Write an enzyme that holds these catalytic residues in place. Structure first.
Site, short mmCIF file in Angstrom:
data_model
loop_
_atom_site.label_atom_id
_atom_site.label_comp_id
_atom_site.label_asym_id
_atom_site.label_seq_id
_atom_site.Cartn_x
_atom_site.Cartn_y
_atom_site.Cartn_z
CG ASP A 168 55.47 36.55 -36.86
OD1 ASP A 168 55.65 37.81 -36.83
OD2 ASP A 168 56.14 35.79 -37.58
NE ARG A 172 56.86 39.17 -40.45
CZ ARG A 172 56.72 40.21 -39.63
NH1 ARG A 172 56.67 41.45 -40.11
NH2 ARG A 172 56.65 40.02 -38.32
CG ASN A 173 52.94 35.87 -40.90
OD1 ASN A 173 53.44 35.16 -41.80
ND2 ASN A 173 53.58 36.09 -39.74
CG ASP A 186 52.68 31.56 -37.91
OD1 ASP A 186 53.70 32.08 -38.33
OD2 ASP A 186 52.55 31.19 -36.74
#
Ligand SMILES: COc1cc(Oc2ncnc3cc(OC)c(OC)cc23)ccc1CC(=O)Nc1cnn(C(C)C)c1
Length: 308
Positions: A168, A172-173, A186
């Site tokens: 992912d 945003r991570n 994460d």
């Protein structure tokens, strides 16, 4: 041959990692998420004898079940296995003893996620700082963006060296700390993926479709080379200064078919030609033909020295 697929057999050494709950002062939520949450806290002597330190704590919330509790324990075990690197959020300790919630404690990253940060600083950007005017202004430059890109590739190369894959990878991570240091994290369960527009319904799951490689969407294949594809999308978010990928494109069956055929995003507004070529290289249709993170590290490090 990913190690994160069989976490339940990894060890938890309490004698090293266990932090007493009475030495942790919980503060404000940084999230919240769906079944998980991240909370700001003050840990007393977690990494330096008798020193107060702000930390981030991941734990469960109302709605979570024993299956999320097992998942957070697996997450702690994989963080222990991965270990420390400047460009990965580092595990400091955990509270796993009965009578209280399982809590995973990591170093605090003052500026939060990179996506929100770059979007907030979009106006305060200059490709190159020009003396004397810009000399005492804290503007974002092309050097800073290439530097964030380089640090994420270094963190990914480190993760790959630990036989782990992200699955992912996105801005945003990525968290931003002091001294322009970025850390891969994460959020998982601590992000409300059911409220978040970055996650699209695909069967019974909510998946980050705009960041997934064609072999992931179509064949459910997750490898270090699908993380390279996500890294290319992350580069586009960085050089668009936090814009959402595939602007104006409806994320449906047609989008996936066009992607599978070789349709790619156009260059973002703040990229250099070579950074856009790096994006296209990460987005090669054949996973084996994409650069590795070691190759990206060398390339971005050369670009950083050429930008100087
Ligand atoms: C406690 O644990 C976490 C805390 C997180 O959030 C924050 N951490 C630090 N500082 C923050 C500052 C903020 O605002 C100022 C913040 O505002 C929302 C969130 C912050 C994010 C993720 C985790 C767990 C995690 O990364 N797990 C994991 C599993 N595998 N890996 C591999 C290495 C990729 C990482």
């Amino acid at each position: 041959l990913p190690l994160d697929e069989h976490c339940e057999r990894l060890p938890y050494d309490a004698s090293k990692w266990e932090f007493p709950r009475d030495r942790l002062k919980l503060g404000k939520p940084l999230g919240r998420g769906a079944f998980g949450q991240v909370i700001e806290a003050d840990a007393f002597g977690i990494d330096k004898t008798a020193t107060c330190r702000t930390v981030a704590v991941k734990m469960l919330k109302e709605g979570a079940t024993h299956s999320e509790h097992r998942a957070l324990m697996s997450e702690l075990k994989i963080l222990i296995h991965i270990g420390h690197h400047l460009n990965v959020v580092n595990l400091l300790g955990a509270c796993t003893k009965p009578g209280g919630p399982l809590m995973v404690i990591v170093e605090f990253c003052k500026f939060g996620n990179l996506s929100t940060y770059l979007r907030s600083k979009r106006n305060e950007f200059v490709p190159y700082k020009v003396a004397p005017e810009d000399l005492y202004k804290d503007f974002l430059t092309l050097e800073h963006l290439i530097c964030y890109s380089f640090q994420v590739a270094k963190g990914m190369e480190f993760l790959a060296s630990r036989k782990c894959i992200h699955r992912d990878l996105a801005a945003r991570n990525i968290l931003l700390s002091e001294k322009n240091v970025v850390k891969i994290c994460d959020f998982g369960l601590a992000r409300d993926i059911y409220k978040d527009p970055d996650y699209v319904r695909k069967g019974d799951a909510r998946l980050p479709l705009k960041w997934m490689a064609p072999e992931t969407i179509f064949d459910r294949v997750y490898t270090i080379q699908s993380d390279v594809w996500s890294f290319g999308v992350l580069l586009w978010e960085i050089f668009s200064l936090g814009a959402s990928p595939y602007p104006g494109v409806k994320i449906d069956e047609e989008f996936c078919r066009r992607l599978k055929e070789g349709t790619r995003m156009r260059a973002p507004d703040y990229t250099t030609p070579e950074m856009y070529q790096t994006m296209l290289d990460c987005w090669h249709g054949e996973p084996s033909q994409r650069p590795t993170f070691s190759e990206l590290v060398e390339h971005l490090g050369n670009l950083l020295q050429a930008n100087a």
